[PDB]
Amino acid sequence: STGSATTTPIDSLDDAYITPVQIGTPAQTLNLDFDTGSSDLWVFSSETTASEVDGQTIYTPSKSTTAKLLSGATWSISYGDGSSSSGDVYTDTVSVGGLTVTGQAVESAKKVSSSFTEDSTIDGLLGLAFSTLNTVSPTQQKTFFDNAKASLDSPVFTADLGYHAPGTYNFGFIDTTAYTGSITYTAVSTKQGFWEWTSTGYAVGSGTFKSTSIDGIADTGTTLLYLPATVVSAYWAQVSGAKSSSSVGGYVFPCSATLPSFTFGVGSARIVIPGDYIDFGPISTGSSSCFGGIQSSAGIGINIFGDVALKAAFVVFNGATTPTLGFASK
């Protein structure tokens, strides 16, 4: 089997991407944030505290003939941005882009933090990191990918995120029309439960490439590119008037600037992030200070190749017995 679904930016900045997902019988379609940095499929639901719902579409298990309470199971998750959610668990039929899994754990939120409530466009998350990170207790659950894997034509999914445009998540096949050149594969460590890999270095603009190992994660659920402070300082030093602002919470730059590109290495290959991808616009409405898309990881504990980086590539998440990542230009 295969599946193919379009993913759409939630706003004009590509802050996140939503992908429609069918849950239950008859189908209830929710728009989920596919997150290769986490392993829970959770939804706004009929159980969510009413004051914490503001415009989201909810899953109502009582209206699904295939829903079953997963008795005694609870979940609770905290993300890198400080957001959180928790609740109880149903199993139900879940389909993405024509690919169906029966018996998927659908984590029903009883509580969500303010950042979820305030984002009316995101009806929940679909985790695509390794199932060792799933938070369901006392019986850990598998991700949609892990449950689909044995049925897929190939044990892979691909992320093809757009810049200010829709893109695609494919399951079970690699669309050879969706990228240019060849795919470069690189090793993955699953020790922390992430799609963790090592970039071979970077360049700023037209500058020389610096060969240096940068361990980080491929995380579709993170907006920005978070790299070591040395790398990030070297990038923003090429932008007149850029500075790190402790009041704003990262590097800002004059909105009048033209940003340089940023290149990262994948083995001997190179992915180029155009400068425009690094512009996240005014820090507040009408400001002439703009927020940068490359920020320091120093306060996180891990480097994160988020959407700024991933949207510049066609990315293969190879879930074979030995997992690997692949990157191609597009």
Tab-separated table of C-alpha atoms in Angstrom:
chain	number	residue	atom	x	y	z
A	1	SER	CA	0.000	0.000	0.000
A	2	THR	CA	0.877	3.695	-0.258
A	3	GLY	CA	-0.574	7.009	0.812
A	4	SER	CA	-0.128	10.547	-0.454
A	5	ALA	CA	-1.482	13.690	1.231
A	6	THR	CA	-1.020	17.382	0.605
A	7	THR	CA	0.365	19.468	3.488
A	8	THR	CA	-0.538	23.186	3.628
A	9	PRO	CA	1.119	26.066	5.555
A	10	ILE	CA	-1.135	27.357	8.352
A	11	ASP	CA	-0.175	31.024	7.692
A	12	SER	CA	1.853	33.357	5.495
A	13	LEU	CA	5.093	32.593	7.403
A	14	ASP	CA	5.017	28.754	7.100
A	15	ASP	CA	4.853	28.583	10.890
A	16	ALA	CA	3.577	25.008	10.606
A	17	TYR	CA	1.893	22.729	8.059
A	18	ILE	CA	-1.422	20.883	8.341
A	19	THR	CA	-2.379	17.666	6.632
A	20	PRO	CA	-5.940	16.287	6.552
A	21	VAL	CA	-6.399	12.960	8.365
A	22	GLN	CA	-9.528	10.776	8.396
A	23	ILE	CA	-10.365	9.327	11.815
A	24	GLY	CA	-13.245	6.991	12.605
A	25	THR	CA	-16.290	5.602	10.824
A	26	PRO	CA	-17.877	7.557	9.219
A	27	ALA	CA	-14.698	9.593	8.657
A	28	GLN	CA	-14.065	12.668	10.782
A	29	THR	CA	-11.444	14.761	8.968
A	30	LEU	CA	-9.059	16.702	11.230
A	31	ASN	CA	-6.119	18.824	10.104
A	32	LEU	CA	-3.046	17.550	11.938
A	33	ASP	CA	0.497	18.813	12.286
A	34	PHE	CA	2.758	15.947	11.152
A	35	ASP	CA	5.694	16.037	13.556
A	36	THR	CA	8.834	13.951	12.915
A	37	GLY	CA	10.052	15.163	16.340
A	38	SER	CA	7.382	13.435	18.445
A	39	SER	CA	5.516	10.130	18.583
A	40	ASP	CA	1.952	10.803	19.760
A	41	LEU	CA	-1.120	11.139	17.521
A	42	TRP	CA	-3.357	13.372	19.604
A	43	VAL	CA	-6.449	15.373	18.737
A	44	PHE	CA	-8.777	17.998	20.009
A	45	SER	CA	-11.887	16.069	20.959
A	46	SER	CA	-15.351	16.061	22.538
A	47	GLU	CA	-13.400	15.466	25.813
A	48	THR	CA	-11.279	18.634	25.563
A	49	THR	CA	-12.021	21.249	28.290
A	50	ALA	CA	-14.525	23.527	26.493
A	51	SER	CA	-12.686	26.770	27.428
A	52	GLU	CA	-9.503	25.345	25.763
A	53	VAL	CA	-11.189	24.846	22.355
A	54	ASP	CA	-11.364	27.936	20.062
A	55	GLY	CA	-12.248	27.042	16.467
A	56	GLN	CA	-10.498	23.633	16.144
A	57	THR	CA	-12.346	20.691	14.593
A	58	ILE	CA	-12.822	17.995	17.243
A	59	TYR	CA	-12.827	14.215	17.132
A	60	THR	CA	-15.961	12.754	18.777
A	61	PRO	CA	-15.331	9.059	19.483
A	62	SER	CA	-18.983	8.450	20.431
A	63	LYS	CA	-19.887	9.165	16.764
A	64	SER	CA	-17.407	6.596	15.395
A	65	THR	CA	-18.615	3.005	15.078
A	66	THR	CA	-14.986	1.820	15.086
A	67	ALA	CA	-13.778	3.780	18.147
A	68	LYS	CA	-12.931	1.780	21.299
A	69	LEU	CA	-11.695	3.183	24.596
A	70	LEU	CA	-8.198	1.894	25.324
A	71	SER	CA	-9.110	1.198	28.933
A	72	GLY	CA	-6.829	2.708	31.561
A	73	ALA	CA	-4.479	4.363	29.078
A	74	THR	CA	-3.484	8.000	29.553
A	75	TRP	CA	-0.997	10.290	27.898
A	76	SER	CA	0.781	13.551	28.675
A	77	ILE	CA	3.313	15.353	26.527
A	78	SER	CA	5.477	18.475	26.772
A	79	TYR	CA	7.126	19.924	23.676
A	80	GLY	CA	10.390	21.888	23.229
A	81	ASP	CA	8.419	25.201	22.959
A	82	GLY	CA	6.838	24.746	26.446
A	83	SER	CA	3.435	23.649	25.090
A	84	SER	CA	1.648	20.550	26.419
A	85	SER	CA	-1.422	18.393	26.219
A	86	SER	CA	-2.827	15.307	27.950
A	87	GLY	CA	-5.799	13.004	28.038
A	88	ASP	CA	-7.058	9.487	27.451
A	89	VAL	CA	-6.860	7.089	24.491
A	90	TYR	CA	-9.124	5.431	21.926
A	91	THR	CA	-8.236	3.062	19.145
A	92	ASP	CA	-9.823	3.816	15.798
A	93	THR	CA	-9.288	3.598	12.048
A	94	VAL	CA	-6.993	6.363	10.751
A	95	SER	CA	-6.345	7.129	7.097
A	96	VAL	CA	-3.793	9.500	5.571
A	97	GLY	CA	-3.897	10.150	1.866
A	98	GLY	CA	-5.632	6.839	1.135
A	99	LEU	CA	-3.437	4.702	3.476
A	100	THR	CA	-5.489	3.144	6.278
A	101	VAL	CA	-4.416	1.804	9.666
A	102	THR	CA	-6.873	-0.039	11.847
A	103	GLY	CA	-6.436	-0.046	15.615
A	104	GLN	CA	-4.393	3.192	15.693
A	105	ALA	CA	-4.052	4.828	19.095
A	106	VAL	CA	-5.862	8.186	18.861
A	107	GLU	CA	-4.944	10.203	21.969
A	108	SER	CA	-7.943	12.347	22.933
A	109	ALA	CA	-7.012	15.613	24.643
A	110	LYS	CA	-8.707	16.501	27.905
A	111	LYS	CA	-6.349	19.482	28.385
A	112	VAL	CA	-4.218	21.506	25.992
A	113	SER	CA	-1.944	24.491	26.761
A	114	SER	CA	-2.667	28.017	25.606
A	115	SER	CA	-0.516	27.865	22.429
A	116	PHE	CA	-2.729	25.005	21.123
A	117	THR	CA	-5.988	26.745	22.014
A	118	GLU	CA	-4.810	29.963	20.346
A	119	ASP	CA	-3.994	28.156	17.066
A	120	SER	CA	-7.426	27.439	15.518
A	121	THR	CA	-5.827	25.878	12.381
A	122	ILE	CA	-4.211	22.852	14.122
A	123	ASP	CA	-6.607	20.108	15.268
A	124	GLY	CA	-3.834	17.939	16.755
A	125	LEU	CA	-0.479	16.320	16.046
A	126	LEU	CA	0.534	13.171	14.214
A	127	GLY	CA	3.911	12.022	15.499
A	128	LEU	CA	6.414	10.440	13.135
A	129	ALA	CA	9.467	10.011	15.368
A	130	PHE	CA	10.266	6.558	16.787
A	131	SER	CA	7.605	4.854	18.896
A	132	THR	CA	9.993	4.697	21.902
A	133	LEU	CA	8.996	8.354	22.532
A	134	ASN	CA	5.247	7.693	22.655
A	135	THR	CA	3.850	8.895	25.977
A	136	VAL	CA	0.891	6.492	26.438
A	137	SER	CA	0.932	4.769	29.844
A	138	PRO	CA	0.900	2.041	30.988
A	139	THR	CA	1.084	0.472	27.525
A	140	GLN	CA	3.184	2.507	25.052
A	141	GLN	CA	1.588	2.843	21.604
A	142	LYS	CA	2.929	2.828	18.075
A	143	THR	CA	2.976	5.695	15.617
A	144	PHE	CA	0.842	5.702	12.483
A	145	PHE	CA	4.015	4.993	10.448
A	146	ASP	CA	5.089	2.095	12.635
A	147	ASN	CA	1.580	0.566	12.386
A	148	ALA	CA	1.473	1.099	8.581
A	149	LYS	CA	5.028	-0.039	7.887
A	150	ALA	CA	4.531	-3.753	7.252
A	151	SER	CA	1.697	-2.962	4.707
A	152	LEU	CA	3.707	-0.330	2.788
A	153	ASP	CA	5.324	-1.059	-0.555
A	154	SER	CA	8.611	0.315	0.951
A	155	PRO	CA	9.112	1.146	4.665
A	156	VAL	CA	9.528	4.883	4.098
A	157	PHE	CA	7.752	8.201	4.203
A	158	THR	CA	8.839	11.422	2.525
A	159	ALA	CA	8.427	15.068	3.428
A	160	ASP	CA	8.267	17.607	0.635
A	161	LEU	CA	7.389	20.885	2.356
A	162	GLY	CA	6.655	24.002	0.332
A	163	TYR	CA	7.969	27.518	0.756
A	164	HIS	CA	4.870	29.653	1.046
A	165	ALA	CA	3.041	26.860	-0.798
A	166	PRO	CA	1.540	23.412	-0.250
A	167	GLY	CA	3.692	20.295	-0.305
A	168	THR	CA	3.318	16.562	0.132
A	169	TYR	CA	3.738	13.722	2.611
A	170	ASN	CA	4.022	10.347	0.879
A	171	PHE	CA	4.001	6.953	2.603
A	172	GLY	CA	5.400	3.787	1.095
A	173	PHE	CA	7.090	5.123	-2.023
A	174	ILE	CA	9.633	7.683	-3.236
A	175	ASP	CA	8.245	9.988	-6.000
A	176	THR	CA	11.220	10.208	-8.364
A	177	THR	CA	9.517	13.221	-10.069
A	178	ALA	CA	9.531	15.304	-6.869
A	179	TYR	CA	13.299	16.052	-6.689
A	180	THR	CA	16.275	16.929	-8.868
A	181	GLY	CA	19.564	15.033	-9.033
A	182	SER	CA	20.103	12.144	-6.658
A	183	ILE	CA	19.097	11.453	-3.037
A	184	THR	CA	22.031	11.359	-0.570
A	185	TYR	CA	21.412	9.031	2.343
A	186	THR	CA	22.978	9.500	5.778
A	187	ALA	CA	23.025	7.446	8.968
A	188	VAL	CA	20.471	7.868	11.719
A	189	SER	CA	20.827	7.268	15.434
A	190	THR	CA	17.574	6.256	17.129
A	191	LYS	CA	19.142	6.436	20.645
A	192	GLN	CA	17.095	9.534	21.643
A	193	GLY	CA	13.984	8.443	19.645
A	194	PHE	CA	14.495	11.069	16.940
A	195	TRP	CA	15.544	11.077	13.298
A	196	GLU	CA	19.039	12.139	14.498
A	197	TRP	CA	21.803	12.545	11.948
A	198	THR	CA	25.089	14.374	11.416
A	199	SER	CA	25.449	17.144	8.889
A	200	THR	CA	28.906	17.477	7.340
A	201	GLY	CA	29.106	21.308	7.561
A	202	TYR	CA	27.790	24.584	6.317
A	203	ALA	CA	28.372	27.673	4.213
A	204	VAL	CA	26.969	31.199	4.498
A	205	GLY	CA	25.967	32.773	1.219
A	206	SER	CA	28.683	32.422	-1.411
A	207	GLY	CA	31.300	31.734	1.310
A	208	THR	CA	33.544	28.699	1.547
A	209	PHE	CA	32.085	25.511	2.973
A	210	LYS	CA	33.176	24.734	6.547
A	211	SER	CA	33.598	20.969	7.096
A	212	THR	CA	32.369	20.265	10.617
A	213	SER	CA	30.096	17.616	12.145
A	214	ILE	CA	26.726	18.961	13.333
A	215	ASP	CA	24.529	16.364	15.050
A	216	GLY	CA	20.839	17.249	14.934
A	217	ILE	CA	17.314	16.038	14.320
A	218	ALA	CA	15.073	16.282	11.255
A	219	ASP	CA	11.937	17.779	12.823
A	220	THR	CA	8.958	18.775	10.691
A	221	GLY	CA	7.181	20.012	13.811
A	222	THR	CA	9.758	22.770	14.487
A	223	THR	CA	9.462	25.930	12.403
A	224	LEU	CA	13.064	27.191	12.457
A	225	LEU	CA	16.636	25.953	12.005
A	226	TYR	CA	18.440	25.755	15.403
A	227	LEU	CA	22.223	25.332	15.170
A	228	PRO	CA	25.266	25.897	17.384
A	229	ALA	CA	25.941	29.479	18.427
A	230	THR	CA	29.198	29.573	16.443
A	231	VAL	CA	27.363	28.696	13.192
A	232	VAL	CA	24.487	31.063	13.830
A	233	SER	CA	26.831	33.983	14.703
A	234	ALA	CA	28.752	33.360	11.475
A	235	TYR	CA	25.476	33.574	9.497
A	236	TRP	CA	24.065	36.733	11.072
A	237	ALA	CA	27.481	38.484	10.930
A	238	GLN	CA	26.828	38.668	7.150
A	239	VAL	CA	23.632	40.729	7.648
A	240	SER	CA	24.163	44.451	8.408
A	241	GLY	CA	22.421	45.418	11.600
A	242	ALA	CA	21.498	41.859	12.706
A	243	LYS	CA	21.795	41.180	16.408
A	244	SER	CA	20.694	38.763	19.060
A	245	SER	CA	17.906	40.354	21.135
A	246	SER	CA	17.301	38.843	24.622
A	247	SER	CA	14.042	40.941	24.759
A	248	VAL	CA	12.698	39.354	21.520
A	249	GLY	CA	14.225	35.914	22.126
A	250	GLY	CA	16.689	35.477	19.256
A	251	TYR	CA	18.369	37.034	16.288
A	252	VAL	CA	16.563	39.901	14.575
A	253	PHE	CA	17.575	41.816	11.496
A	254	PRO	CA	16.475	44.950	9.650
A	255	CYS	CA	13.459	44.253	7.510
A	256	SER	CA	15.259	46.206	4.738
A	257	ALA	CA	17.987	43.508	4.504
A	258	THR	CA	18.487	40.978	1.740
A	259	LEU	CA	19.434	37.728	3.526
A	260	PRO	CA	22.201	35.394	2.329
A	261	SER	CA	21.501	31.749	1.650
A	262	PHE	CA	22.616	29.036	4.067
A	263	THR	CA	24.034	25.706	2.882
A	264	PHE	CA	24.168	22.522	4.948
A	265	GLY	CA	26.044	19.335	4.108
A	266	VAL	CA	24.585	15.859	3.731
A	267	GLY	CA	27.584	13.625	3.221
A	268	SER	CA	29.305	15.073	0.143
A	269	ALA	CA	26.038	16.716	-1.018
A	270	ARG	CA	24.832	20.244	-0.246
A	271	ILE	CA	21.319	21.596	0.416
A	272	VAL	CA	20.949	25.341	-0.131
A	273	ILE	CA	18.367	27.265	1.888
A	274	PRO	CA	17.586	30.491	-0.034
A	275	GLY	CA	17.845	33.687	1.996
A	276	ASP	CA	14.132	34.377	1.665
A	277	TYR	CA	13.357	31.159	3.570
A	278	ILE	CA	15.197	32.669	6.600
A	279	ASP	CA	12.879	35.743	6.802
A	280	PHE	CA	10.138	35.342	9.405
A	281	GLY	CA	8.887	38.906	9.078
A	282	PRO	CA	8.280	41.715	11.552
A	283	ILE	CA	8.639	40.839	15.222
A	284	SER	CA	5.335	42.625	15.878
A	285	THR	CA	2.895	44.022	13.439
A	286	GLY	CA	4.354	47.078	11.624
A	287	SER	CA	7.888	46.722	13.110
A	288	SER	CA	10.963	47.236	10.946
A	289	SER	CA	12.778	44.561	12.995
A	290	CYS	CA	12.350	41.126	11.440
A	291	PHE	CA	12.775	37.734	13.108
A	292	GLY	CA	15.436	35.352	11.799
A	293	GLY	CA	14.837	31.807	10.693
A	294	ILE	CA	18.220	30.535	11.862
A	295	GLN	CA	18.565	30.662	15.660
A	296	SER	CA	20.953	29.281	18.298
A	297	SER	CA	20.318	25.863	19.764
A	298	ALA	CA	22.519	26.627	22.790
A	299	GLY	CA	19.466	26.883	25.204
A	300	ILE	CA	17.824	23.572	23.809
A	301	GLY	CA	20.398	20.763	24.188
A	302	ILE	CA	19.982	19.594	20.546
A	303	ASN	CA	20.371	21.032	17.055
A	304	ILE	CA	17.106	21.005	15.090
A	305	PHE	CA	16.769	20.911	11.319
A	306	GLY	CA	13.202	22.281	11.352
A	307	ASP	CA	11.003	23.400	8.507
A	308	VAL	CA	13.361	26.223	7.345
A	309	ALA	CA	15.899	23.547	6.435
A	310	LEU	CA	13.603	20.679	5.466
A	311	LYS	CA	11.489	22.764	3.046
A	312	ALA	CA	14.634	23.332	0.949
A	313	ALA	CA	14.859	19.554	0.285
A	314	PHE	CA	12.998	16.406	-0.606
A	315	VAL	CA	13.503	14.351	2.563
A	316	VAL	CA	13.266	10.558	2.849
A	317	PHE	CA	12.579	9.078	6.256
A	318	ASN	CA	13.717	5.464	5.702
A	319	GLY	CA	12.263	3.215	8.404
A	320	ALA	CA	13.983	0.019	7.284
A	321	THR	CA	15.565	-2.190	9.982
A	322	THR	CA	18.574	0.180	9.863
A	323	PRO	CA	16.911	3.620	9.513
A	324	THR	CA	18.488	6.315	7.363
A	325	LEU	CA	17.611	9.824	6.144
A	326	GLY	CA	17.852	10.916	2.539
A	327	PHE	CA	18.054	14.456	1.169
A	328	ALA	CA	17.704	15.675	-2.401
A	329	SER	CA	17.505	19.149	-3.886
A	330	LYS	CA	14.225	20.058	-5.611
